[PDB]
Amino acid sequence: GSVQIVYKPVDLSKVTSKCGSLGNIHHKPGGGQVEVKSEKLDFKDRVQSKIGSLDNITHVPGGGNKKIETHKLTFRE
Amino acid sequence: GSVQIVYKPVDLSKVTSKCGSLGNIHHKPGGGQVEVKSEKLDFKDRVQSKIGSLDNITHVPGGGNKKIETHKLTFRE
Amino acid sequence: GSVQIVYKPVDLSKVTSKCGSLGNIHHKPGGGQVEVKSEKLDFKDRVQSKIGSLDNITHVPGGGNKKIETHKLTFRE
Amino acid sequence: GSVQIVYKPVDLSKVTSKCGSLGNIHHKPGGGQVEVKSEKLDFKDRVQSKIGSLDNITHVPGGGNKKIETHKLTFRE
Amino acid sequence: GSVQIVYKPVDLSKVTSKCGSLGNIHHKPGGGQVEVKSEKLDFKDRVQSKIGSLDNITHVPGGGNKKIETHKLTFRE
């Protein structure tokens, strides 16, 4: 027997930002010690480690509009 | 026998931000010590670890409008 | 026998923010010690650990409008 | 025998924020010690742990309007 | 025999906030000690633990209007 699939998505979205002014973003951490003690580091199959860190991230987009879209069609028989 | 699928989504959304001014974002942590003691670090199949950290994230979008959309069609027989 | 599916969603939503001014966001933690004692760290199949941390996150969107939408059609026989 | 499905949702929603001014958001914790004692950390199938933490999150959207929508159609025979 | 389903929801909702001014949000905890003593940490199938914590969350939306909607159609035979 026949089958029919019409996969027809229509998109007219708007992801809009309007910022008149952005200013005076201060970022002054004091910073502290990190002391890590260990003996061995046996790692395996999938490891995303991080041992000992002082990260400082300043992220000022002036418009950081994201849009994630995901389409999928699966056919079996 | 026949089958028919008409997958027809229509989208006219608006994700809108309007910020006249953004300012004076201060970020001043004092910072403290971190002391970690261990003997061994045996890791395996999927590990997302983090041992010892002072992270400082300043995130000022000026419009941080997200929009996550996900479509899926599954056909079996 | 025949089957018919008309999957027709219509969307005209609005996710709207209007902020005249955003200011004076102060963020000044004092910061304290962290002392962790252990002997071994045997991890396995899915682990999302975090041992010892002073995180400081400042998040000022100026409009942080999210919109999560999820469509799904499943067909079996 | 025939079947028919007309899945027709109509959406004209509005998720609206209007904030004239946002200001003077102060965030000054004093910070305290954390002392954790253990011997072993055997983890398994799905673990989302966190051992020892001083998190400080400042979240000022200026409009934080969320909208979660979820559609699903399931067909079996 | 035939079947027919017309799934036709209509939505014209409004989730509206109007805040003239938001200000002077002070957040100053004093902070205290945490002492945790243990011997072993055997975890298993689904664990969402948290051992030892001083979390400080400041959340000022300026409009935090949520709207959760969930549609479902199930067909069996």
UniProtKB/Swiss-Prot annotation, chains A, B, C, D, E:
Phosphorylation at serine and threonine residues in S-P or T-P motifs by proline-directed protein kinases (PDPK1, CDK1, CDK5, GSK3, MAPK) (only 2-3 sites per protein in interphase, seven-fold increase in mitosis, and in the form associated with paired helical filaments (PHF-tau)), and at serine residues in K-X-G-S motifs by MAP/microtubule affinity-regulating kinase (MARK1, MARK2, MARK3 or MARK4), causing detachment from microtubules, and their disassembly. Phosphorylation decreases with age. Polyubiquitinated. Requires functional TRAF6 and may provoke SQSTM1-dependent degradation by the proteasome. PHF-tau can be modified by three different forms of polyubiquitination. 'Lys-48'-linked polyubiquitination is the major form, 'Lys-6'-linked and 'Lys-11'-linked polyubiquitination also occur. It is found in: Cytoplasm, Cytosol; Cell membrane; Cytoplasm, Cytoskeleton; Cell projection, Axon. Tau/MAP repeats lie at residues 3-33, 34-65. The modification N6-acetyllysine is found at K8, K14, K18, K28, K40, K44, K66. The record marks K8, K14, K18, K28, K37, K40, K67, K72 as: Not glycated. There is a cross-link at K8, K14, K18, K28, K40, K44, K50, K66, K72 (Glycyl lysine isopeptide (Lys-Gly) (interchain with G-Cter in ubiquitin)). Expressed in neurons. Isoform PNS-tau is expressed in the peripheral nervous system while the others are expressed in the central nervous system. The modification Omega-N-methylarginine is found at R46. The modification Phosphoserine is found at S2, S21, S49, S53. Glycans are attached at K44, K50, K66. The modification N6,N6-dimethyllysine is found at K8. It is linked to In Alzheimer disease, the neuronal cytoskeleton in the brain is progressively disrupted and replaced by tangles of paired helical filaments (PHF) and straight filaments, mainly composed of hyperphosphorylated forms of TAU (PHF-TAU or AD P-TAU). O-GlcNAcylation is greatly reduced in Alzheimer disease brain cerebral cortex leading to an increase in TAU/MAPT phosphorylations. Frontotemporal dementia 1: A form of dementia characterized by pathologic finding of frontotemporal lobar degeneration, presenile dementia with behavioral changes, deterioration of cognitive capacities and loss of memory. In some cases, parkinsonian symptoms are prominent. Neuropathological changes include frontotemporal atrophy often associated with atrophy of the basal ganglia, substantia nigra, amygdala. In most cases, protein tau deposits are found in glial cells and/or neurons. The tau/MAP repeat binds to tubulin. Type I isoforms contain 3 repeats while type II isoforms contain 4 repeats. Interacts with MARK1, MARK2, MARK3 and MARK4. Interacts with PSMC2 through SQSTM1. Interacts with SQSTM1 when polyubiquitinated. Interacts with FKBP4. Binds to CSNK1D. Interacts with SGK1. Interacts with PIN1. Interacts with LRRK2. Interacts with LRP1, leading to endocytosis; this interaction is reduced in the presence of LRPAP1/RAP. Promotes microtubule assembly and stability, and might be involved in the establishment and maintenance of neuronal polarity. The C-terminus binds axonal microtubules while the N-terminus binds neural plasma membrane components, suggesting that tau functions as a linker protein between both. Axonal polarity is predetermined by TAU/MAPT localization (in the neuronal cell) in the domain of the cell body defined by the centrosome. The short isoforms allow plasticity of the cytoskeleton whereas the longer isoforms may preferentially play a role in its stabilization. This is Microtubule-associated protein tau. The lineage of its organism: Eukaryota, Metazoa, Chordata, Craniata, Vertebrata. The chain holds residues 621 to 697 of 758 of the full protein.
